[PDB]
């Protein structure tokens, strides 16, 4: 090979045949949450158990 | 509402759970002396090596 080569550079790959080292160190994490609620409660009462003579009509 | 005409009661449920996973690991802790096969245009060396060990029964 007659190609020029720098002395002080970091010897990065530059041509087709050059080799490079890859450190994967891949780490991905995704999360998703959702919630919903709805509560309705009702309860009504009414009773005499004793009615006046004048109110017995109703 | 004299009878149970309006009396109502109902329940419903729907539960789903899905999971998935995968793992893949490998390790290698040896030392092998190889020989150059050819010299590439950029100066990289193609190395091939082989070592056979017959401890016993194989
Ligand atoms: C947002 C506000 C808007 C305004 C709303 C206006 C009011 C909106 C309306 C509210 C009132 C509900 C109407 C109920 C009667 C009715 O029409 O709807 C019925 C179906 C229900 C539909 C309602 C959906 C509304 C939908 C909701 C709408 C809401 C908006 C049909 C029906 O009619 N069903 C019917 C049938 O059943 P059956 O199907 O099986 O056959 O026959 C059986 C057997 O009949 C009985 O027999 C008895 C003997 O056996 C006999 O006694 P006896 O003496 O003879 O012995 C006895 O006679 C008697 O009461 C004898 C005598 C009693 C006097 C005692 C003193 C009481 C004073 C009491 C004073 C009251 C004080 C407020 O009378 C009366 O003078 C009644 C008083 C009149 C007051 C007038 C108000 C002046 C304003 C005074 C103002 C005061 C100012 C401070 C006989 N009673 C009857 O006939 C029935 C009827 C005879 C009518 C002739 C009298 C002149 C009416 C003249 C005019 C009336 C017009 C309305 O009286 C009533 O109640 C009428 C009540 C009216 C109140 C309105 C208030 C307006 C405010 C004004 C506001 C603007 C009944 O049981 C059954 O009726 C019952 O069960 C009813 C039960 O009791 C009482 C439960 C009340 C609980 C509260 C409701 C709770 C319900 C809540 C859930 C929904
Ligand atoms: O007023 C009506 O229409 C009703 C009152 C109830 O009794 C109901 O159940 C029906 C019955 O089927 C008659 O046989 O009649």
From Swiss-Prot, chain A:
It comes from the Bacteria. One of its GO terms (molecular function) is cytoskeletal motor activity. GO terms for cellular component: bacterial-type flagellum basal body, distal rod, L ring; cell outer membrane. It is found in: Cell outer membrane; Bacterial flagellum basal body. GO terms for biological process: bacterial-type flagellum-dependent cell motility. Keywords: Bacterial flagellum, Cell outer membrane, Lipoprotein, Membrane, Palmitate, Signal. Assembles around the rod to form the L-ring and probably protects the motor/basal body from shearing forces during rotation. Belongs to the FlgH family. The basal body constitutes a major portion of the flagellar organelle and consists of four rings (L,P,S, and M) mounted on a central rod. This is Flagellar L-ring protein. It comes from Salmonella typhimurium (strain LT2 / SGSC1412 / ATCC 700720).
């Amino acid at each position: 090979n007659y190609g020029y080569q720098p002395l002080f550079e970091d010897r990065r790959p530059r041509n087709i045949g050059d080799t490079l080292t890859i450190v994967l160190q891949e780490n991905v994490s995704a999360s998703k949450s959702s919630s919903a609620n709805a509560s309705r409660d009702g309860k009504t009462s009414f009773g005499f158990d004793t009615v006046p003579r004048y109110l017995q009509g109703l | 509402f004299g009878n149970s005409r309006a009396d109502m009661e109902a329940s419903g449920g729907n539960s789903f759970n899905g999971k998935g996973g995968a793992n893949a690991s490998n390790t290698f802790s040896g030392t092998l002396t190889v020989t150059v096969d050819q010299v590439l245009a950029n100066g990289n060396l193609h190395v091939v090596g082989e070592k056979q060990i017959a401890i016993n029964q194989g």
